[PDB]
């Protein structure tokens, strides 16, 4: 690949009719097609001596008896700018001569526009390695051989900035590092593999319900590269025994290709690729990733943002994208502080069995600084089949029993799982999880709209405190019945909006909601107030109400104390049939519990039609304390005569006894 | 137009302070800023032949007599591989010279450095036909001009993947067929338009809302290719009688320009418009269509994804972009299973005048082969004027095909409409929907968020059991009152929560929810109970009732047996001021129903302002059958004796009458 | 600061052996890879003049004394169109030199062979200016160095479709137009600012609070672009006091760098970015901005969609990213009419701090014709803390002069801001707010899922009438009490839906919700009797009712009229304990208001587990007027007789005093 000529340096000047130096000759350099004696129309000239120093000198140059330029006798180099006219006087005022552009006489003049009409780019396949490509790259590279490559191959781009494109295969086991790559990058289409064939557990079914024993899943224990994932140090915890079950060599594995962008500020990955591939940014600010399209998890986590080093970090999204399978949580954030301006966050995500969380805005101290997310956005994102909460959204779950926290405010200031990370949710969606749902934990912010469904664990294990809850949905969770409820909750709430009673009724405690300490209004089912924990339940809004009771033979409407009794009613209020069913007419039964029984003390209007109030009386004498309520009779009976009489409270207050009936 | 100078490329190398040639002596180029004697700082040294031989020699270059570089007896050209530092030895052994950095470059060569630093991209104005730059491309291709077609352009890429970028017109009617295609191709911009000018109809007024007559859908007929499309099989079920009136050359239109792809791999278009034009991906899997620049349909459909022959679809996407009109459905998938990684559908769609649906897998078998599809998702659909079903996501018909369906859960496993889908429903959106605006039909679906508003059509036609559905907010469906169905399903599903009634629509007053059979619960709006026909309405999770009037005089709460009567109610709750308002006065009747009317038979308390409870009696002597309650006395009266008397059914169960008033 | 060297271009030829000058030579110039002597192998050669003239000259050259070429005696410049072979001979005809090829390549082949491969793209370093540089390009432009320009610069481009992927800064003081782009043209990578840094004010401290008095506001004046927002003339409004606080330089100046493009037709705008940008789309039909990378704004409109030039506009949309701080609204909408598509949207939009408004329409006439927009679409988008209202939709308009628009319909005729429109709005969010969380007009519209949550100011503020909404949210808002409300609508409409109170209603001061003319219904939460007040608020659609206490003695199912007391009861179903707490036994009062007092006048059943109704009595006559209802008795006690007696008014409808109870 030789480039540059062993050409004479030092050019020689030479008369224009005699073989012979132009001894003691002027030269005049000056602007493009400009004559260069009139001093107006020169340019600079320097000279660059041993150190690399510049120094400008006197216009005309001085031709000595051999025919080079000299300043005071001794030889020089004179360097100036691309373009400029040349000038050749002899000492004598003769012309010598006269070059009007020196840079038209370059042999190959179709090299100027051919420069200046297409445009730049460079192609892997006629270099050895990356290095040389990314050193020769101008505007962008082309990859169309499948590289080969290990873990510590560093390739430098220069601070020149490029739109690196993809069309081939990275193979090798290690990790790749992009380093110095300036503001404004493109890369698309990146492709990742690795050569070893690592060992990956099976925990689902051919009809993909979870299938739980440790078992089953080592029996389904399989070399591949994608159905499946390695198991973690989670999944010890999710299952139990399968530590021990496992064959050794499975446990712990590191087998990653990863691509790493080290400290580069706005660089944009396009459409990301490849299977059990990882793609983490370092310290990167303001840079994206933009519909990566299904790639195969590994060991990393496949979206990882990593903050930890430096400054914090902000502006690093995943806009849209899909992604398979991956031993941790697929979209992990770390540090990230997404300022006044709620930077930071996921947008349109789709992860699938992702090892911890389709997004993990990791929570207390990691490593030897904070990795709390504050400010982020999380909006129309998706988690489908994953082993833990696909919102992982809170930053203070068990850990940090310190009253204080490094880099960030101490528990003493603002408690624990009761802190501003002030992120904005909405639209987000879990369908099919092994373990918990949706797990977040804070104080001050404002979640809306969750939906999850279909969870094997519970589909809520909040715990948060001060937050507010709108049009929240989740229905159908805790199927399998690890928890006695559907949803956890720990501190206070205000749940405006949510729907329960599903397909498979819960049926572990008989307790479907258990916030008993937090405040939850909207509740929708016919959920028993025995399966109902709240710390409030007041719908305070309703209007003109109308009650419904279909499929039922008698309308029914119950008021409930629970400092009485839980399963039972203070009251209930039924109205029946009168006689067969379309009679046209329904006698209304108003009762009460006493003595633990409902429906023992019940008072009816219009009996089997009757046109009358039935008024029930004291079976013994009626005790001065039984009534208090002054200007009221309380009736009473005499087994003895066998006739009503009174007990009256006369508006005074003084009791009498009275006969209301007799014989 | 010159292009290459007359130049002598062979340097000539002379004195320093003579004019006379260096006679036969050394060279030595090195490291920059470095004495080259030494063998440690030199550089390599390549003689380039007259062909490019780049053979290398020993360091010290020999000087002829004429100044000119010498090896073997001929004149060399050498080339180094950077910057180096010279030193010329005169042939007595003194330095002529020394310089520290000295760098010209090869004027030659330069049709390998053009293949090495630019950008391949072949265009049509250089190739007649598209199969020659299809043969000539390697990177890129751009069609610059405007295309010709006949019906069957077979176009084959040979295997290399590409990027078609596109910047005219595909004009012409008939296929366009693309084959052999590398995983990871492009295409982007491509625009087609059909060559005649078909004959389309007019199925709207131009002030809102469709036409519902066949006078002035045929007055209202031009050639045009926009503001209309053409007729198909199934508009005469919607306007009867139009078959005996269109041109023929109407009837059965062939005028559609289409965009084919066969048998490959991961091939996306992006932002693809066209007038008549629909885009169909045959066998094709991990395709997607990224956005769209609004194509005009054709008589097939816009985006047509189509898998019956060989495996299932698998990764079939369309992401973003708007279509405008079509014959025959927007977006249709056939024969698609996502797997268990779920991957298919539509994320984020828009259509307006979709003939036959916004989205709709085809049901049932065609040709040979089922068109069932597993695992499609559907969210952030926008859909406007279907024609037809909003989104046809069911795939069954109802028209029973071949027992025990070829490829699917057979009818012994798994009856008519009775399939599972598996499928991933969430944020809907329809209005002006002359069609049914939803329609589905399987066995234990989950769908969540859809919304259908101002709709000429019917709301919904659910035909699935057992499933789970949420807020579908039904507002003014049925303009002018076509069926008698809005919302109506056929299984025992949990429709928990909802939302009726628009300004004014229910069918004409006359029983939207034709759901007796589904546990429905969480329904609110201004709909009648006499309208509801549920299995289940009870919303029994409820809390401390408020019941605020406004415009009432009175205040309401009521319990109704529908059975008796679906218009009147069986008993109530009533808060009625005494005399006039503003008194801080208002008394309780607690009421029921006797003989099909409401307020006949009640208790009150404080009837007007009478501080009492007023309870009625019966008129004539009361029998011991209305008085079914032990230790209790119903009152009557006697017109013979002009008083009152009680029946008095006591605790031991036996009935005695006493005088219970008499002056 | 120099890079090319000074050399001798004109070329000197010597002989082979010797240091001696081909004296009187020949030049023979011939086809590659021949022999040039022969008259059949040579190739046209032309003598190149200073002035770029061209003389096809015979071909055997002359080689004068000093080894220069002459013709006439004066030294030339001998060029070909191709690639030659040259031959050196002496005047003795010995042979000094050949060479076979002189590029080692043919240019004439080759121009047409890589004008065939390669991409077509010009670069901006290439030519001084952008005019020039675009008259030359012919598909793409590459923006390598930042480009100076000046306000009201025009570039044109002749029509043709370019991509121009925008590559480095591009700085400059105004407006820049762009004329004369084809379909299909692309901007990508752009990035706006200027010179001048402003004047800005800070009105917004750390505790995420807003700095409401004048001179706090400006306190924190800076002179910077971003963190911060240029005053503008409705910040006098907004800001009392601001009118004389700020010095004459902060106010009356308009710095904007904007790339404005005008009378354009599809044009897209990608991953546009800028310190205090600014991009006006004038005239432009089928345009779109596909995603954002925050740009900050300056003084004018930062997304300004105007159609002020020619006709209506047509589908110009805003797809995806997001954008930050602005001085005036960050999406104008100017003229654009959206046909039946209802064309024209923004989507997945996060603004942030915009002067104004995230979207706004505007009104009247501007410029040279009406200013109104008529059918448009705002799905998904939000807009987090601006200062104005979140999204005026206003397309009827709210003109505080004179109703009558011009060049339009009436509003007399069309009451209070009425024009049927139907824009379409779903999942729009606000937060933070001092203006208000949503402002649109229109009659027939649908407006769902909307989620206005903890801003500053009220939640909503609406002009609209028979219009419906639904799922609509607003939560916790209003704190400094903007309004006098939260929500607040100005007309008569449907609103199937409110989802109040987070923790605060105003201060917890009155009129939370403001209704005069306008039906809601099925709203839940902790507001109170108190807080509503609308025109209706009726929900007929449920089903049946359970009253549920949690830490109370008491179950309420409660029933007040508003007509009555706004705290009082009218009456209720109240339900307590008998004894202590946890006893088993309940008792129940239906009670009614007696003097502006709750629970004066009740029925007690199981009082103290007596097991029977209290009957209180009138203390004293009962009169004529206080029972009427026939076949009933009212008891009343006489103090005379100190007896309860009994008013008993015959089925027939006749008055009788009896004696209920004496001994």
Redesign the interface.
Known sequence: ?????????????????????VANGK?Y?GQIDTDPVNPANQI???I?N?D?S?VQITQP?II??????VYNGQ?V??????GHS?AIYDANGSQV????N?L????????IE??????????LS?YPTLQDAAS?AV??L?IDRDYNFYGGETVDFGGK?L?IEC?AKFIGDGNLIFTKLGK?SRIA?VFMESTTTPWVIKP?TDD?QWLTDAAAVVATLKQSKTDGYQPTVSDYVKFPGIETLLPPNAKGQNITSTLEIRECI?V?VHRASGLMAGFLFRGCH?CKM??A??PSGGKDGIITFENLSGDWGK?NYV??G?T?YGSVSSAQFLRNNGG????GGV??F?S?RAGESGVKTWQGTVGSTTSRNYNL?F??S?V??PVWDGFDLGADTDMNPELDRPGDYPITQYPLHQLPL?H?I??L?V?GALGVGFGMDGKGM?V??I?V??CAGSGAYLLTH?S?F??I?I??TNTKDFQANQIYISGAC?V??L?????RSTDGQGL??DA?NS?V?????????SR??????????????????????????????????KT????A?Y?H??GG????????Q?T?????TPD????????????????????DI??D?????S?????Y?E?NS?????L?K??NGEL????????
């Open positions: 690949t030789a480039n540059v000529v062993v050409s004479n340096p030092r050019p020689i000047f030479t008369e224009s009719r005699s073989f012979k130096a030269i350099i600079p000239v320097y660059e041993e690399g510049h140059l000595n008896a051999a025919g080079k330029i030889l180099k004179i360097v100036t700018v691309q040349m001569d006269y070059i009007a020196v038209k006489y370059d042999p190959d003049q179709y090299s051919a420069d200046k009409k297409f445009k730049y780019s460079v192609k006629d020769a505007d962008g082309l900035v739109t069309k404004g289409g689902w993909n706005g944009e303001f933009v519909d399209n299904n502006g806009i849209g899909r398979s006044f301006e709620r930077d947008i349109g789709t699938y956005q909006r129309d998706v489908i089949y002030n904005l909405d639209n969606l369908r404002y809306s709209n939906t469904e279909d001060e507010v709108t049009n949905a229905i159908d205000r405006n909006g729907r329960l009673i599903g397909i479907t909601i008993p405040t209004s909207g509740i929708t089912g016919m959920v028993d107030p109902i924990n709240v710390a409030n339940l007041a719908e305070e809004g309703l209007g003109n109400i109308r009650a419904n009771s279909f499929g039922y033979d008698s309308a029914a409407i119950k008021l409930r104390i629970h400092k009485l009794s039972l009613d203070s009251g209020l109205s049939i009168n069913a379309g009679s046209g007419s329904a006698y209304t108003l009460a519990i006493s003595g633990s023992a003390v019940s008072l009816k209007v219009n009996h089997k039609d009757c046109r009358g109030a039935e008024i029930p009386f004291v079976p009626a005790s304390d039984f009534i208090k309520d200007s009221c009779f309380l009736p009976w087994n066998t006739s009503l009489k009174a009256v006369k508006p009498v006894r009275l006969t209301l009936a007799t014989l």
